[PDB]
Subunit: 394 residues, 4 copies
Amino acid sequence: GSDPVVIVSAARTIIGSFNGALAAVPVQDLGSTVIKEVLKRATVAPEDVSEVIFGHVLAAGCGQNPVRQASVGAGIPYSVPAWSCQMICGSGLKAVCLAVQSIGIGDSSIVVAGGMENMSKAPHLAYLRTGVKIGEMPLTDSILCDGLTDAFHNCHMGITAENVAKKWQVSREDQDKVAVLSQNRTENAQKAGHFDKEIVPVLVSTRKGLIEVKTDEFPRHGSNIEAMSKLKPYFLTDGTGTVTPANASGINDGAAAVVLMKKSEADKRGLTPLARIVSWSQVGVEPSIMGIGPIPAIKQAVTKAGWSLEDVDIFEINEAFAAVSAAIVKELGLNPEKVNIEGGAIALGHPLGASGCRILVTLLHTLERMGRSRGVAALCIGGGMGIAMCVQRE
Amino acid sequence: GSDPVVIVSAARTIIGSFNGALAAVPVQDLGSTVIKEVLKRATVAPEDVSEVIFGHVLAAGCGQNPVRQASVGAGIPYSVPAWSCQMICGSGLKAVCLAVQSIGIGDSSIVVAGGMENMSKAPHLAYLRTGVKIGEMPLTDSILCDGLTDAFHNCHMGITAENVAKKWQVSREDQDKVAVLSQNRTENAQKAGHFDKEIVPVLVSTRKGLIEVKTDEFPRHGSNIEAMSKLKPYFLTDGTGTVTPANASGINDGAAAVVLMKKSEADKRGLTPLARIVSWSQVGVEPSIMGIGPIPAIKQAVTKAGWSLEDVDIFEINEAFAAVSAAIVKELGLNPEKVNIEGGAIALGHPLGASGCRILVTLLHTLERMGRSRGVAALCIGGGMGIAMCVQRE
Amino acid sequence: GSDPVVIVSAARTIIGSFNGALAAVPVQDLGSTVIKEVLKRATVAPEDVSEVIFGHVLAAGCGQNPVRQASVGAGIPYSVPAWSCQMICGSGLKAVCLAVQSIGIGDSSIVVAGGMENMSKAPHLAYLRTGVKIGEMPLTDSILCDGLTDAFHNCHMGITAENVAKKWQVSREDQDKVAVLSQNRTENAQKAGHFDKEIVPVLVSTRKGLIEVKTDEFPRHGSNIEAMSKLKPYFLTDGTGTVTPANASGINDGAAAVVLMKKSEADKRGLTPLARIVSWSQVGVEPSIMGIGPIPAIKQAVTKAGWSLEDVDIFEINEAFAAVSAAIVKELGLNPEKVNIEGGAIALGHPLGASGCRILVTLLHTLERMGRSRGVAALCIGGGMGIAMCVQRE
Amino acid sequence: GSDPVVIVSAARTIIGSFNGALAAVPVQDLGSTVIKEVLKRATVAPEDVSEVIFGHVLAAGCGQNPVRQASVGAGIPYSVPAWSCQMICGSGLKAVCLAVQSIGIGDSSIVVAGGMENMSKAPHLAYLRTGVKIGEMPLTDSILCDGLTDAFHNCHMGITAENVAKKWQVSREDQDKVAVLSQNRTENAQKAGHFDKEIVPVLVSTRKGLIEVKTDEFPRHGSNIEAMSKLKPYFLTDGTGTVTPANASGINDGAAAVVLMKKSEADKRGLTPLARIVSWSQVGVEPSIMGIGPIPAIKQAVTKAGWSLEDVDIFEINEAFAAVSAAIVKELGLNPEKVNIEGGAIALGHPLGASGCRILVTLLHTLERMGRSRGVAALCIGGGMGIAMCVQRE
């Protein structure tokens, strides 16, 4: 307000496929990569950062405070506090909102906010301290257990997605159409070089030495409805299923970051920002339909901004499932030509902790590239939440 | 400022011993217990909570967003956003600072902040996705890996404690004296009923049915220097060791919570708060001496409050190791009769995610009970950080 | 025949309770203990042993050829071949029959035969070579998996025991009576010192140094029908159950051994043997009723010996379940005062690989102590087999 | 003697590569395949089998008595006893010797003897019964632990192989030459169809349905010394190494079986056997040089047969390591044109429990195919043993 918080820089790694191009790279090295890069791009010295805040969901086995590791690995001094927040899929966006708060209230001057996740590296879990006298014991998958299973209904996110498909009447055919659209938009954007600016290469040691990874791995080029309609429903196999692997996102690795400060601090430094942050909201809804979280979230953020929905030029609405993104667009009555125009997570992938910031990074570069003005990033969150941010291009 | 953020209520579970009285209780049930109770005590209806923020470090195997589970298990509606932060030992206090920020900036009206940890339930970890063709594979202890091992030097917190012992010249004899003091102060406080008010019983099913757990489990009554001086150093066994199990805290389970709102909202509701929050700080230091984090943290918080150190009536300085707490007190020149007067974590235990808020809960009730005015809660943090808060009794 | 194979010496360790007195002792050290001891007792130099043959069922994690380890640990040279056989519960007796064959045919001159098992040390199992992309994986209990589960019907031995109880009409009351009898006979034998001769102490390091273990651990003195009839059926909980923990044996650790050679070699050496081996049999039956294996086994061995059943003075019939031992005795019409007179495995325990030889050791010492002449050792075997041996006291 | 034991039939599966063509096939199904087939070939009804004896080393996770499972899966009745022996690498040959003994002494009339191993399916091991309060725990590889590690010196078989290389002066160049020879002989035999008769196809379900596997998988066609001499020593990397993957065998899956009875029983049935068994030996040597076990073993078997070494037309000497097979041939002064003429385990692979019988199967078919008369099968055994058999073609 008058001196709003602005985003000066924004970058992401490619999104790697499960057990794919980024699987050997610890999550904190993904974090370091984007942290170092956004500072570079903003021309901000690492010692001028007030704090680092990252979303990060599946942190088992990553060592003590992996954000701090990521921060220091980027060349930020030990003097700079660094910490993580978890709000499942919303975690990466929540990190940025939290920065908005510390800067707005006058506690931080410059913040590197973001999200990070290496799901390929998520371990299996065993409780061994008591000691099992006799009987089988599970090695539980932390991804499933901590990432993808609703704690209230003990069901996969994909089941909640079927609830939304049912209730918002998004057919199998609808979902496959959204999926094809998402895949084709991503392929068009890739070929047109639309992601080049936002991507920062990741360094990976191979048997044939060091390599740069700089193409998103998860897209399935040549996606078509005929192929997709042959697949069987994955979560719900009693003949009422609609969600398949083709119309859902995946398990993925990646990180993203943004540099934030006040407009006045940007002016003082001779920086022109990507955008100003106008508003944001977090809301709660029923776990059984967590997918529709962004509906109340968007309506509140947009309202808080003094906007009507028509005023929004571009939406990024996390595409965890076609069933959910379709339902959100249908209920709000959004123009699909304004929503996920470079494609969404069905094509690009969904590294839980990173996605909130990743879609923001994309949003901001899309707005910039198209010379459009007003954007909304939003995500549904397991357990029944939604988060949304309003940004306006300077 | 003019309308400061106040703490209306504050409560904790007992602290359970490793694999002890609370080990069968999932961490989110510990959270629910304290959340429900602080609302009860503040007379605030659960549907009036703007959000829930909890510190939580070892979240592997706890399911999707265990704070949200804890929130809902306390009777807070699905409409109320709930999420976690991780800043190792500082996590529980960081949760409260974050609430201060959301309330200060006008985003939240009422917040339940806190921390929670069941270390007994922390699993072992195995990476099984690639597949090991031939050879041994570790089942890594998440407590050690993610909780207690410095990521920069690959050494136990207890090793960093020896660095501080060495550098601040805190002898074995000094450490054992601090340990005895801590144990005796805790035993005196227990017998005098000083913890009765702050403790909320935990419900536990046993073979002989339901029981209430309401005594802290970890204290070793009759602690004496003669016994302690017989023990061997645990981390550093080359004849230069000082830290033993008797002069370090433990692995422990527990939770704690506070209810926060603006002074004006408290006045409107006819509530008298425990205290107002005057200031807080987070700082970074070298990982090798993470223990001395609270020195810069305290100095900055106290300075920001407009106080001198003499102005502080009561300190709670987390007693992870006698070596560290002694070093902090020595360097700042604090009166030991003002520091951890009900005893500290050597006697009480250290459930990582909970401790930041737990010491705050104790602080506030001590200030209340003694009719003293100004308090400081502070903790060192693995990886090289410190966090401190200033509170003033209304 | 004319120059029959004789048993010169026979010894056993105590039988340890699951996770009890012998759990820290590797199975091969149990083997070494009994091997060394029987050589000592027979006055046979270790370098005169032709070969060592031991039954051993649960060998996972025991290292390369644990019989060979056991042999060498007893002071038998590297020049002496040593190897194991597996025939589940019959394994320890099968080892002795196999020795009878190598000596009878003229391939071996002196053989140490026996059985050994540390079930406390049996590991859990995980298949990790492929690599599990996503999902839970079992840590399977090798005891259950490889020891106690019928491979044909995928059911616990205790289920097959219920089949025999049903079909041979052995009531819950019958089973509990057999159990009390077994417990009381064992307690009487212990107090009378009847096991003193056959037991060889095991050496175990404790925190208070080295100790000798020389009392069987599993017996429940003061066993009574009133207590037993209060227990619930363990395997079959649909209201048709009869088998409980009180009328079944346990999971147990132990070893036993015997020294064998021809009568002529014994005469040459100035040794008087415990007994001569007269006959033995191995038979197959249906897995669903594996418990009744000893019926055809005994009938064939006794027939091969030229005996009638009345001619047998003493039987040892492995008491895996009261339901099975009762059924065997009922069908064959045996005098219960001739069967398991020092008690059986319900009281003493059942270390799978050892039991076949353990009951033989006991048989031989009982025959000796009572001055009786003709004995039968027999066991049922998981998967549907029976094994029996006839011995005659010289 | 006068009525010697004869082998009527002999068959093997292909040998599968680690995690290769047979990895999804449980070991007992490999057993059933060869058991059923040898009965078929001998024209012996399954109900006429007196007993089944198989070598089997890595039995963890295979269920109760996997030989019995294998027997019944081949259509052998429940009435036929079936059991396993373990003598590490010698296990498959020991099974046959044991049959010789039961038939020779008049206890069995017809025996199916053999060996079987699925090393791909060998699990990792964890001891979980006590309960680990705090710290890392190993998931131990049962292959390494129970199969490939000398229990006396705690070193890989490959280390003992280096001891033999050193002591018998078998150079790196020598070993690579033996390896190339073995690979080229196997490739020549394959192309000439020499294994066709002995191989029995294994049935495997694939995504594209059922398939027959009938080519040995492990051979590396086009093996050459130039390639081999580029490899680095695998076990001993201090610059004194000679053993590499190219001049050692592998980890492999397979089974083999033979049908045995007396010559008189063969005559009565109108069967002409492959060969008569003339003699066999088992011996012990120092674990550090277990590889040279076959030297004393062969000398004793050949001596017991009334043969000189020149009398042996064909040897099969298990080729665990070129270093060992070379050393055996050098010391005994054998013609390399008489030794492993279809190639050995360097090319064919080494499924521990199966190999003893596998080389016997090959021996017998080679003797038959070449119209040669006298053969020797022999193997070294971990822990310091050797086993050898003499056969003579009828």
